[PDB]
Each structure stands twice: as structure tokens, then as C-alpha cells.
Amino acid sequence: DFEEKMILIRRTARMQAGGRRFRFGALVVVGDRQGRVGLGFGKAPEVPLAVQKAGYYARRNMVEVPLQNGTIPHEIEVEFGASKIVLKPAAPGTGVIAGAVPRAILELAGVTDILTKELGSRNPINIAYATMEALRQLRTKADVERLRKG
RNA sequence: UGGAGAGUUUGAUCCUGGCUCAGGGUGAACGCUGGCGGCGUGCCUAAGACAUGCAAGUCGUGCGGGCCGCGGGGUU
């Protein structure tokens, strides 16, 4: 019912009297490939707990994507921190052309053909957040004419 | 009908930032190896120096001759 894929898993370290102590963080995307996505970043002393916590947080933070024949309705451009994401719709038969993070996020959203570009900072966390905000700032023609009813 | 990034400054982080890699290309060369054919291509350097052969001539339907040879005439 819900597909789950991890973006990256890292081990951070805090200093304490005696040495360094490690804590694992993990990004996880969840999607039904029908138009709903979810991104989560979980931290835990061990890797499996971090993955499970990231899955929970991802399922808690969902985004409804307005797919239009497997692609996006309009080109977007989002700056999250120093990381820029550029999305652009593509005709079918093109495929998803993106970095690892945006490819995973868009594939779990149900996108089949899209053109992307990462600019500025290539940080996977910030790129993921920028892609999520990009999918969140998507508007359909129905939404546009709904905002201009008056 | 068109756009993917990654490694690397830190104990860990974010940023700035350079370096490097994955791609495509060549009138290429070098190493190891090397079976066939078709089509292309082959002094990028000394516009340095060149043996040798060929590469620009052709018209007797423009004209008069030389040399070699033959035939027929004027003459017993």
C-alpha cells in the first residue's frame, strides 16, 4: 500500500569526556505512486531505529502531488537554504532525469517523465526539502481559476 | 521531445571554495593483443633539404623547310 525507500544514512558524532559517541540519521521517502509523497528524517542511536523513525516521520508529513499524465503541471524552482531545485514537465517516453534524491522522491510520488536540475548546494537533505516544497507549491489550472473567481 | 551527479577541508555540521571523477569527441600517438570484408582516412613537426621517373601540351584543315627513303617525269 505504501512503498518506502531510504535516501541516505549517515553517522554523526558528538564529543564527550572519553571520546566520540555516534548517532545515526536517515532520510526516508514513502509514496503510493498515486500522487502522495512523504519525507522523513529520523535520528536514533542505531541504524534500524533511525530508519523506522524516519519512516514514521515521513508518513506523518505527506504532500499531495497534482500529476497530469505522469508529469508535472508546470515548471517550478525552489530555494531551500543554499540548495536550488529546478523541475520541468516532460512528454511521456522521457523518463525521470534527476539526482538520486529527487529521482527517488518523484518516483515514489508517481512521476514517470520529468526534467530536474540541482543547483547551488548539493546537500541531499536540503535538496530533498526543496523538492518537497516544490511539490507543495504545485498548482493545477483548476486551482488557479479557483483562486481568481472573485 | 529537452537539463542526473559523485568524492574530497571537520570529532561531527551547515556554507563558501577549489581540485578530481563518471560523458562525448580526435588527421591521434604509445603499451599488450590482433581473423575477414566494405567505406572513409592517413607529415598536425622543418613553408627544412631533395636523387630519380612522370606531372603541359596540342594543331600538316595556318606556313615554308632540313634529314632519311621510295615512286613517277623533262634527257639517248
Ligand SMILES: [K+]
Ligand atoms: K528562499
Ligand SMILES: [K+]
Ligand atoms: K562527509
Ligand SMILES: [Mg+2]
Ligand atoms: Mg495540491
Ligand SMILES: [Mg+2]
Ligand atoms: Mg543563497
Ligand SMILES: [Mg+2]
Ligand atoms: Mg558550490
Ligand SMILES: [Mg+2]
Ligand atoms: Mg515544448
Ligand SMILES: [Mg+2]
Ligand atoms: Mg509542443
Ligand SMILES: [Mg+2]
Ligand atoms: Mg564540491
Ligand SMILES: [Mg+2]
Ligand atoms: Mg578548518
Ligand SMILES: [Mg+2]
Ligand atoms: Mg578527517
Ligand SMILES: [Mg+2]
Ligand atoms: Mg570545531
Ligand SMILES: [Mg+2]
Ligand atoms: Mg574524457
Ligand SMILES: [Mg+2]
Ligand atoms: Mg573520454
Ligand SMILES: [Mg+2]
Ligand atoms: Mg604486433
Ligand SMILES: [Mg+2]
Ligand atoms: Mg600494434
Ligand SMILES: [Mg+2]
Ligand atoms: Mg581500405
